[PDB]
From a paper:
Bacterial infections including Salmonellosis and Shigellosis affect millions of people every year. These bacteria use a T3SS to secrete virulence factors to manipulate host cells. The T3SS is a multi-component system that forms a continuous protein transport channel through the two bacterial membranes and the periplasmatic space that extends into the surrounding medium by a needle structure. Tip proteins, which bind to the distal end of the T3SS needle, are thought to play an important role in this process. [name] from S. typhimurium, IpaD from Shigella flexneri and BipD from Burkholderia mallei are tip proteins that are thought to interact with their corresponding needle subunits [name], MxiH and BsaL, respectively, to make the needle tip complex.
Here, we address the questions of how the Salmonella [name] interacts with [name] and deoxycholate and the mechanistic consequences of the assembly of the T3SS needle tip complex. We could show that two different proteins, structurally conserved in many pathogenic bacteria, bind each other to constitute the needle tip of the transport system. Bile salts influence the T3SS of intestinal bacteria. For instance, the presence of deoxycholate either impedes (S. typhimurium) or facilitates (S. flexneri) host invasion. Noteworthy, it was recently shown that [name] and IpaD bind deoxycholate and some of its derivatives.
Numbering used by the authors: 6 to 77, 129 to 178, 186 to 335
The structure:
Amino acid sequence: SGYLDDVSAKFDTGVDNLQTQVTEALDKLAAKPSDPALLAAYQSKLSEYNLYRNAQSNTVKVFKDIDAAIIQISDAEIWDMVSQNISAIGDSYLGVYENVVAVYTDFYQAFSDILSKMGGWLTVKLDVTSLKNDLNSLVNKYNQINSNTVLFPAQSGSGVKVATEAEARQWLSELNLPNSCLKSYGSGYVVTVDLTPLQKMVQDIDGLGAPGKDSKLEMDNAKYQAWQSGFKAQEENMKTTLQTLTQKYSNANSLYDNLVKVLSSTISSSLE
């Protein structure tokens, strides 16, 4: 509607420009595959690319509300109306991340609670059978599809909300999670927490050997230290995963804010 048309172009151009920067960033990374910073730059670009496409696909809904709000002018005021009239985008981007981190945190806490009773299960003798029972139970619980396991889509209330495969795969790639996290359900797909560390744990407990009468298992210090270390390392992986999702969320907040600045500056210039 008049000045909105300009804003629509800005998204198109932005989407085009980003599509190119995602490629440029992927190349730079290819040349130095193990660089932490190059990987994040590439991924930020992808996240940003997905964000503009998101906005692009919500053009109709968003422009409608913004136009209304407009039909009633400070730059700060423009920025504010844009800020409260783009939930279509906000809820499907930041809302998702908010949910990803909330769910992964609860998942990690559930694990922490299990660690709490390790001493109670301890050459050395470890209550192998009972520790593995809690781990295996944790796995089966978080290996289901419900509001305690799903990262994307956000599960709003009672029932199970799914997405198309491409949508879920896009979030799978943005969160950089393994394929084991992608699950089918009903008409679509969902992204759930990574259980690989837990499964590796119970798996390694099995490698300690069959227990005895106590159903427990005693082992010399060498064998125990190596087990305790491999175990702690798996816990660290889950901790690392939680932290990377948190950092991606924080990065997303900044990309979202920048998009709002662009959107606002355009609308402003268009009204002049």
